[PDB]
Amino acid sequence: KVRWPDFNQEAYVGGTMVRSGQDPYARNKFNQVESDKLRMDRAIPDTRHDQCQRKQWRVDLPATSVVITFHNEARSALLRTVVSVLKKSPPHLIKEIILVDDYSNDPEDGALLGKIEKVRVLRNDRREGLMRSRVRGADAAQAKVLTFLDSHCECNEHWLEPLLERVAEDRTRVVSPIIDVINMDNFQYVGASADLKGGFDWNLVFKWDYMTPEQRRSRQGNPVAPIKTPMIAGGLFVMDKFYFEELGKYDMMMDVWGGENLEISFRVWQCGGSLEIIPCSRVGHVFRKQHPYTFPGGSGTVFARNTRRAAEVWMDEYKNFYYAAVPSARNVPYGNIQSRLELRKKLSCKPFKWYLENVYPELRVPDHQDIAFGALQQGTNCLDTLGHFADGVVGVYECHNAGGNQEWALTKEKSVKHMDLCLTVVDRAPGSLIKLQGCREDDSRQKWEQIEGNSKLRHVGSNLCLDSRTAKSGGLSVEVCGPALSQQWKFTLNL
Amino acid sequence: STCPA
Ligand SMILES: CC(=O)N[C@@H]1[C@@H](O)[C@@H](O)[C@@H](CO)S[C@@H]1OP(=O)(O)OP(=O)(O)OC[C@H]1O[C@@H](n2ccc(=O)[nH]c2=O)[C@H](O)[C@@H]1O
Ligand SMILES: CC(=O)N[C@@H]1[C@@H](O)[C@@H](O)[C@@H](CO)S[C@@H]1O
Ligand SMILES: [Mn+2]
Incomplete structure (x- = not known):
């Protein structure tokens, strides 16, 4: 096992590099040439509010297990995500980093990183998708707190302590950093707005909403206070591990991508927890416009299937407003939801109407x-x-x-x-x-x-x-x- | 297909 600075980045990234005259966007739907030029620990601007920069973050916090799933990620971006976690987190608060290789073409993408201190790699022997891959990583986790990240992220200064603090105080809070933007063309790291909340329209597609003028005014006293959000973006969050298990992990019958962020947001709120965005925590993410990987059955049908599974379990009669927005979804078979229904029963969750009235009234x-x-x-x-x-x-x-x-x-x-x-x-x-x-x-x-x-x-x-x-x-x-x-x-x- | 902050 090797300390991260002793890892041979040049060898690892070399030999998956974009060949001369080839399209630098084809494999990843982001610019791999620009990703590959970057050092594994490149410096990035501190995008936090001034008030965060002055705070001294508490010490005795529970450690976390970081789970990162990936399917054919660019080596440069995967390595960089792992090193930003190691470099920007107090070492005693990182128990381990679990990489779930979700049936990548080349098993070496993951296996070579297994040399690095604290890194554990798990390989799926067939394609499982992000929901089942995350559950497999969570199941393997040894710490009391789980942290999920996409495989193309870069953590900023003191990103972790603010998140862990919230959940150490109250384990029913599920919390997210502000997600900074890593530009898909030039890889510049760009500070996002702190005035945003997660949301959706009746098509059940995630979108960012600005806070209302009144919400903004009421925070003028503490502008880095936690922000309650109806919905998390999905890929970057921190959650108490026993809580994640008690609430039923994720729906194991969801496939590939899409819908699980919606399902877990509804479940957490309806069943007595909360969702927050924490402005003092900043993590960059490579946002892209297209998926670079396959969806067995077609992406439109998978997304719809997953979303139906969420809507049919959690939304009560309001599911009809989704079918009114996306009538073609009514023809997509979605399988058996009995264990999810039984989960909801067992937890005594509030009805969707309560969610609309108390959590997302602006919809x-x-x-x-x-x-x-x-x-x-x-x-x-x-x-x-x-x-x-x-x-x-x-x-x-x-x-x-x-x-x-x-x-x-x-x-x-x-x-x-x-x-x-x-x-x-x-x-x-x-x-x-x-x-x-x-x-x-x-x-x-x-x-x-x-x-x-x-x-x-x-x-x-x-x-x-x-x-x-x-x-x-x-x-x-x-x-x-x-x-x-x-x-x-x-x-x-x-x- | 996820949109940026
Ligand atoms: C940042 C964030 O938030 N986010 C979110 C997420 O989290 C989700 O939640 C969605 C929903 O589903 S949305 C959003 O989205 P986005 O970003 O666009 O997408 P992406 O990146 O593609 O990603 C994915 C992951 O996984 C994995 N994956 C996938 C697929 C498969 O199959 N497998 C895997 O692993 C990969 O690798 C990666 O890593
Ligand atoms: C004044 C004008 O040109 N008209 C526009 C409206 O018709 C709406 O689309 C507004 C958005 O709610 S914006 C803007 O007021
Ligand atoms: Mn992503």
């Missing part, structure tokens, strides 16, 4: 009797109030997926509404502009219905359809229904 939820909801799209344009109020015209604007003036519902009363304003047919002569007015159930001018496979909107009791052809010369209008592209409209959720 906009449709009324239970809405016919359709979300944005109303025509190509890459969306129905938009333009900031107008009652008596104002309505228009289209490029879809931006940020809600506000592009948020609509088709109600049980057949009205197309935003807040308490409704699209109103003020004049039935073809070519007339429509107007926003206060919604009244008894106003027949405000009644609309979806036609032609939920692809158009017709004013009830007429042959008039909602039409955008006059959008830049006045606003949306009503025109006789016909084969015009300017009459095509689709809600993002159809119930």
